[PDB]
Amino acid sequence: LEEQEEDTFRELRIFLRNVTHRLAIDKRFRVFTKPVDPDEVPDYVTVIKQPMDLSSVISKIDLHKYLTVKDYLRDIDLICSNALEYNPDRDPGDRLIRHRACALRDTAYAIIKEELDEDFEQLAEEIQESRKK
């Protein structure tokens, strides 16, 4: 039996949860730690069809929705792109949130590039591919 594939996914999830935790406790990214509240931003749902935030990323780790770093960074990229699509550039608060969105993306990418073994990631990607096939 090849339970080694599951060992890969277990180690991936532990790594993803640790990365997400480090993003979620960074004061810069507090705005991305909870879903956008339509009571405070009533037009958000009219711009953004696929909302995403760091607490939802945690839930998706728990539910085994990330088999690859690519799948995970897709959701980090979604947090960023939603913020850049939704938020205008009209006052200093707008500029601040947009900068934090890019810094979230860049921080997640930099951590993964520094800390993630390339062969481990490729193995995860290719198990996902074998399971698709």
Binding site: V41, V47, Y86, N87, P88, D89, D91, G93
Partner: peptide
């Protein structure tokens, strides 16, 4: 883009 979150 939308209204923004400044209120």
């Amino acid at each position: 883009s939308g209204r923004g979150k400044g209120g």
